[model samples]
Target: VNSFSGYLKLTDNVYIKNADIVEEAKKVKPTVVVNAANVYLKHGGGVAGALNKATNNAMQVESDDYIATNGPLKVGGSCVLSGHNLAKHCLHVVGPNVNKGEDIQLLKSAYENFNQHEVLLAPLLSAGIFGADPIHSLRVCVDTVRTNVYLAVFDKNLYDKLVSSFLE
Candidate 1:
């Protein structure tokens, strides 16, 4: 098990830390791991794709099943599915595809839905293929969740930026 260290508090209940997301999710045992999915819930790339690979494609299978019954998941909407490889559940949110400095209200809206989970782990949404700043995007995520939220950082520079921002 990994002991929590080198974590900076982003809010009363939110923390920003650098670590392997999959490893931290397993060690921390959060109730949910919030992942970014497309409208079709397809794991094309980014955090969603990572989750799909980590879960042995179980995440995609579940999200696809959800899409079959409920239609495409809209931006700001979510589909909760059982976690196959880590955590107890996975909250798949359809994040918006916006350019830099554009409004990301949908991303905030998507994260707000995760308040029910006691412990939640999330990646920096909209930062990869979606074209948003990781720091800015993660701030929205951290701002929304009411309960304990862990923001996973995969890159050292990103981690340093988050830490610096928190200190400022």
Candidate 2:
């Protein structure tokens, strides 16, 4: 079995942890990895940039093609793309920009939009530059995603906060 530290079982299939998502996803071998992306699909910074780099920058190329073909994704929208190094596929989700006053409903929708997969790894939706509270994002992940999920988190403080809420 894989050894995952700081991971708490939040549900039958969901677990949360403070981890380097690219490395954790490598170990977990999730079928799809979620990219916390902007509506325009630019994989410039944050989890988007990380995933893009892991994929040898092909993710950004794929995103450009996808946007050219399908247009920009709306907030709360999602789509699948080729995941070169991390997993079989990448699921790009456009979450609500809380700083822009987008509602939690949109964030919830982003959580619900991924296609089914056996195991999926995702970052905390909207809790980064998008600004949703870690509690809110964690709660939504718990409620919406029922598949095998590894909520690989980046912020230690947020991870601590999430643990306090769920695993304590």
Candidate 3:
């Protein structure tokens, strides 16, 4: 339902087994940290599909840069979670169910390295952000990354706050 409706804090409710991902996302700290999950996959000839709009900078919806693809997970199924299909602007990285070696190459392709500036990254357990729990996914993503990364939970209030902070 998030076609272009600005923002709102829907709910902090979700069933997540990871404690770290859950706790940090809820905290209203000035800044946050995150990590990226290493995945493996076969090239689909285009950018990841889970990202909503595959092309980078597709729209000015969310802050963090996003990239996503579905390597092995089947999209249509009764077992799929209701949240999977949500989110207008998101970066979804798809890889094989497990790492086999192809992931390293994909990882290399995933990143566009530049020494002058850092690219903002937002990554999480595939099931966490759009499919699972936001809080948990935020934690995992924030904790895993070793560089400067900003976590966006699709909240208007937080997004505005970040915008103001960036302006200052």
**Among all candidates shown, the one with the greatest lDDT:** 2
Any runs in candidate 2 off by more than 4 Å, and if so which? 1-6
Tens digits of per-residue lDDT, candidate 1, 121-164, equal: 78777777777777777678767778777788888897888778
- Per TM-score, the best of the predicted structures is 2
* Candidate 1 CA-lDDT value: 0.77
lDDT of 1 at 19: 86
lDDT of 3 at 38: 23
Structural similarity to truth (TM-score) of each candidate: 0.87, 0.90, 0.28
lDDT of 3 at 89: 20
In candidate 2, list every pair of residues with a backbone clash.
none
Whole-model lDDT for model 3 versus the true structure?
A: 0.28
Indicate the worst ten consecutive residues by lDDT in candidate 2. 1-10
Off by over 4 Å in 1: 1-6, 99-103
In candidate 3 the C-alpha lDDT for residue 129 amounts to 23
